[PDB]
Design a protein around this ligand. Structure first.
Ligand SMILES: Nc1nc2c(ncn2[C@@H]2O[C@H](COP(=O)(O)OP(=O)(O)OP(=O)(O)O)[C@@H](O)[C@H]2O)c(=O)[nH]1
Ligand SMILES: [Mg+2]
Ligand SMILES: [Mg+2]
Lengths: 97, 285, 65, 125, 125
RNA sequence: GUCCUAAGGGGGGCUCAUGGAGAACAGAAAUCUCCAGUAGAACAAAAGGGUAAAAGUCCCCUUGAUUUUGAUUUUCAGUGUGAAUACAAACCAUGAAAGUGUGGCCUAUCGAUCCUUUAGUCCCUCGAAAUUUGAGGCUAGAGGUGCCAGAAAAGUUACCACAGGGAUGGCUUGUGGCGGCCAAGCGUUCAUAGCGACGUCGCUUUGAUCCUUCGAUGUCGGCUCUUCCUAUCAUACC
RNA sequence: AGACCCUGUUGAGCUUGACUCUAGUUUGACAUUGUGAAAAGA
RNA sequence: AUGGCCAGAAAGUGGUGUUGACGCAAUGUGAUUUCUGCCCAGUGCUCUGAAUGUCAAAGUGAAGAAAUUCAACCAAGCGCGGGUAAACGGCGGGAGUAACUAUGACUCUCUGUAGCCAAAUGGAUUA
RNA sequence: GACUAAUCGAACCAUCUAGUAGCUGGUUACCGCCGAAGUUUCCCUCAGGAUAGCAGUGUCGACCUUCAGUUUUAUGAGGUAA
């Protein structure tokens, strides 16, 4: 049993249903159906948007060479790295068991 | 596993409740006689579909060290092995190796009689189709030992060799070949392996009259060295899993013929002898 | 969707029960929850079992379960 | 002893440290029981100093959702199918059905009963 | 208990008591509980509304008011002899005495009331 | 920092790295031709025997991004048409076919101005002086919630009290909804679509049955008494 | 200026493995605490 | 009774107590009649029964120049292991066995028109 | 939760004490000169904050530089009618 599975069993967290965990959502503003993640997902919304407003404070604090168009990819990569670190820790503990 | 193909390979090699048909690896040592190679060819012909064949020379003595055999089982996902060898002491040896969890469960040696060996090609009859399972007959008193011995081990190993694929149904046209293993208790007893094709004739009754004709090969074995399983590994290997399609029986819960779940209640005997009726005024004389 | 069903004998009422104000389908072998643990009330007079279903190709309307 | 405090009780019962808790858990109350009893206390909105609802009650949201159905190939397929052999077996099952007072029905089988029940009498038809 | 075992998947089983007025539904609930938890009276219609009683942890009993299904073959005499109505609120109760005298054997009436020798219900009364 | 009708699945065709001999620029190294090439390339894994008319590489089709059913397996369910899960079956994709294949992979969260920890020899101070321990300051490093600490301050008041704040509408009436068809007309006549009353057709017992009454959150009454409306029960006329 | 509803950095009474304490109770040690024996150790 | 139940800030203090189990104190139920669904052993009640597993202060030992640090030892209670007011609570039965003790587990199958028996009565339908 | 001097879910008296309230009420001559405002931007929200913007008195600096919710010209968007 992994760390999340033990925590969910202790806290009474129920698994999400297959309809609830679908990779689909309805965008109101565009009036279309879109994916939450993956290729052309909503987690990377605006990376191909022709116009992006940027705040002056964040632009000044932004390092040279980096653009605003890769910030969401940076956040996704950080979240993926954290998730894979937790997965590897769980795998190592299961291998020790 | 990155690719879906490697993922499929790992899922196929993963343990399952309903196991896959077992695979047999045919391989030989540094020296191996032509008669032993012919015997391996005959056995591979009988088991073509679920076998893999090596073609090099392997410096392996299985009863001394079987680490290489375990490595080959790991790599090829083969749970049965036929190992060929020749020697001055043991001129024609077929070593049957059965694995469990990529480790050696048990092993048995067969010494082949060279003068009485006849290959499949020496019989001019119609042969078994590729993939078709033969039926099995085990005859003699050597297979009914109360203690587990080499003959019971050989019976189990030959059953596992000639199982093929299990099936709940079979066509009546798939009952044309029979493999017969004969061995009696006793100087060393001879385990005789024969294959026959089956012909049917009218007999004036409902059941047909069965006549046999030899198909080959003709093998005579003397049982040699025996490596028995460890009791714990044997218990783990002889554990039987239950499929999800096997319903666990619940008390007073059943399924009817329409599929409704039916419960049973038990009223018990009605004992009104301990009941006193009301002593009414109109019943008092 | 839901209206508050008030309970209690005081002037201040408890309001945890919700009554379903649209028609529902409760399925076969349905038994209602006990009133102490029945948050959602689906009334019997709003329960349906059949519908008038039209087939666009065959141009037929049939009452179906 | 060890102590009647909740910290000592959790140390005695061997809870994993750092886990969240629902407000109101004690020796007599678990999280599920606390939720069950808090359902009875639900039903009141949050109001400001002038009585205007700033947070609606449970299942009283007043927020209009987007009621949309996505395109899907599952909407145009057959959900339940049955074969003629299975139908004939079920017809024979109702042919051989008998009634037993000491058996109870626990769960009905979802079946196309109009194809399995025998037809009405010819006089009635 | 057997029914509760057959429905162990649920949190409880509920057992509702139905029947004619004054057949003993509340008395059955009180006898199963071992305590006077439902009101019992020889007057029909003592129970007016439904009532929940916890018998065991997974068994509930539901008391219901007594019902009389309407039948066109039923007479007021039949209903009164079955015990639907109160005899205090009926008009001319002596007309139902011959039905009672037909239902009860004569020696039972004589031994009950220590009186004999009548030729009809009027003289008996 | 860029780019992509995504990956995957099926079927079909082809053979790679390299070497030699040749071809304007082209010359060790561009491209094209032939010959030889057991894979010495590529793709996976960590062979002591992976893959060659393929498991490599290009075309065609699907791209529907996680289907349906189950009285069965496991776990759960104060929201019990069960959910998640396993297995099976059906469906689906592709192919002439034999067949092949899919219908996911994971994970508590919270701090980084945080937590833990190391060094300073030639850094400073311990305020009567010095030495050795010790402590503090300052500076410079290292790691990241397995070995980086920790994250448990509830209710009730119908026994009550106080400071305050409050208490849709020229609506409605007599004729159902959904689906199809017809249709005078409106439009259109570089498109012949689209709106469409009147209607119509489908679903919603030979005068029967009486053995199927389907949930109070929303509250009305009664008395006395006056007037008004007409949407008239009676009386008057037609 | 009642009642009812709503709000409070609300007040107060009451309950409970809510938090921090505590009366009472219980256990150990030190002192009050002296005179001799017999054993076991250091 | 060197006791229980209390009271008091304490006391060479007070009450119960001019008391002693047919008594005192605390609970629950509430005349009489009726009356104890069946069987346990999860929470709880109580067992000085073995343990040092947790284990405060005091005390003991070792190192250091000392401040100090590290070790065992370590009362009650907790824990472990036994019997129950079996109170709360759980509790569909009855047979077997291969387990062998708890928990088993795996099969089987279960539905008198006013009597009889009880020390007149069969009752709460209680005056 | 009855009673304990018309006072009881904790009597009455005096004092700390002019206790605290963000809540309620009230807050005293005249004339003159100016004179407003409601997501602008950031922060976990409600029982939230700052902050931009808009104003008045004084001054000071060469009250120096000129600028402007406007049109035109060139060039964008709208190539859309025609
Ligand atoms: N002798 C005898 N009398 C009974 C028995 N059971 C019930 N009674 C009597 O029958 C009367 C009816 O009892 P109830 O419990 O009120 O029955 P009910 O059907 O619920 O009556 P309602 O509440 O009015 O519908 C009671 O007054 C009892 O005295 C019985 O087993 N034996
Ligand atoms: Mg009743
Ligand atoms: Mg009654």
């Amino acid at each position: 049993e992994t760390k999340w599975q033990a925590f969910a069993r202790r806290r009474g967290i129920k698994p999400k249903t297959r309809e609830q965990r679908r990779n689909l959502q309805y965008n109101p503003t565009t009036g279309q159906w879109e994916r939450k993640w993956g290729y052309k997902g909503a987690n990377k919304r605006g990376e191909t948007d022709p116009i992006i407003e940027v705040s002056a404070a964040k632009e000044a604090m932004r390092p040279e060479g980096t653009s605003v168009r890769g910030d969401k990819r940076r956040e996704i990569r950080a979240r993926v790295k954290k998730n894979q670190k937790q997965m590897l820790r769980n795998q190592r503990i299961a291998a020790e068991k | 596993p990155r690719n879906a193909r490697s993922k499929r390979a790992l899922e196929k090699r993963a343990p399952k409740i309903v196991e896959n048909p077992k695979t047999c690896l045919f391989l030989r040592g540094t020296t191996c006689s032509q008669i032993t190679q012919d015997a391996m060819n005959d056995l591979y012909a009988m088991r073509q579909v679920h076998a893999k064949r090596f073609h090099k020379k392997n410096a392996i003595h299985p009863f001394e060290d079987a680490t290489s055999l375990c490595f080959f089982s790991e790599k090829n996902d083969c749970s049965l092995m036929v190992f060929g060898s020749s020697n001055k002491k043991r001129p024609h040896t077929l070593t049957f190796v059965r694995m469990f969890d990529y480790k050696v469960l048990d092993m048995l040696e067969f010494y082949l009689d060279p003068d009485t060996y006849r290959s499949i090609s020496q019989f001019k009859t119609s042969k078994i189709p590729i993939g078709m399972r033969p039926m099995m007959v085990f005859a003699g008193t050597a297979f009914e030992s109360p203690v587990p011995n080499a003959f019971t081990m050989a019976k189990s190993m030959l059953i596992d060799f000639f199982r093929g694929e299990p099936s709940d149904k079979i066509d009546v046209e798939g009952l044309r070949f029979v493999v017969v293993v004969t061995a009696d208790e006793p100087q060393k007893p001879i385990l005789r392996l024969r294959v026959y094709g089956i012909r049917t004739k009218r007999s004036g009754t409902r059941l047909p009259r069965v006549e046999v004709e030899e198909h080959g090969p003709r093998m005579d074995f003397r049982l040699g060295r025996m490596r028995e399983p460890d009791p714990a590994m044997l218990k783990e290997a002889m554990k039987k899993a239950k499929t999800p399609q096997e319903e666990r029986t619940k008390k007073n819960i059943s399924m009817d013929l329409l599929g409704d779940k039916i419960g049973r209640i038990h009223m018990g005997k009605t004992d009104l002898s301990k009941l006193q009726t009301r002593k009414m005024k109109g019943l008092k004389r | 969707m839901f209206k508050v069903v008030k309970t209690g004998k005081k002037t201040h009422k408890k309001g945890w029960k919700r009554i379903v104000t649209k028609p529902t389908f409760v399925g076969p072998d349905f038994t209602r929850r006990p009133v102490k643990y029945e948050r959602f009330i689906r009334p019997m007079g709003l329960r349906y079992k059949k519908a008038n279903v039209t087939h666009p190709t065959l141009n037929v309307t049939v009452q179906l379960p | 002893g060890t102590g009647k405090k909740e910290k000592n009780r959790l140390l005695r019962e061997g809870r994993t440290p750092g886990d969240p808790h629902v407000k109101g858990e004690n020796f007599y109350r678990s999280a599920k029981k606390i939720k069950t009893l808090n359902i009875l206390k639900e039903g009141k909105p949050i109001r400001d100093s002038k009585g205007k609802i700033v947070k609606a009650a449970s299942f009283q949201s007043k927020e209009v959702p987007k009621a949309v159905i996505e395109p899907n190939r599952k909407w145009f397929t057959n959900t339940r199918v049955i074969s003629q052999d299975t139908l004939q077996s079920f017809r024979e099952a109702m042919a051989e059905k008998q009634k037993d007072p000491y058996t109870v029905l626990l769960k009905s089988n979802k079946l196309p009963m109009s194809l399995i029940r025998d037809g009405p009498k010819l006089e009635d038809g | 208990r057997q029914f509760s075992v057959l429905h162990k998947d649920r949190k409880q089983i509920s057992v509702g008591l139905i029947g004619y007025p004054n057949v003993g539904k509340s008395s059955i609930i009180n006898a199963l509980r071992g305590k006077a938890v439902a009101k019992v009276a020889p007057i029909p219609g003592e129970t007016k509304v439904w009532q929940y009683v916890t018998l065991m942890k997974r068994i509930y009993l539901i008391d219901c008011p007594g019902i009389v299904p309407p039948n066109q073959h039923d007479t007021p005499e039949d209903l009164l002899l079955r015990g639907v109505v109160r005899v205090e609120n009926v008009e001319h109760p002596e007309q139902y005495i011959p039905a009672v005298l037909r239902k009860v054997k004569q020696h039972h009436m004589e031994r009950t009331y220590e009186l004999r020798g009548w030729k009809d219900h009027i003289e008996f009364l």
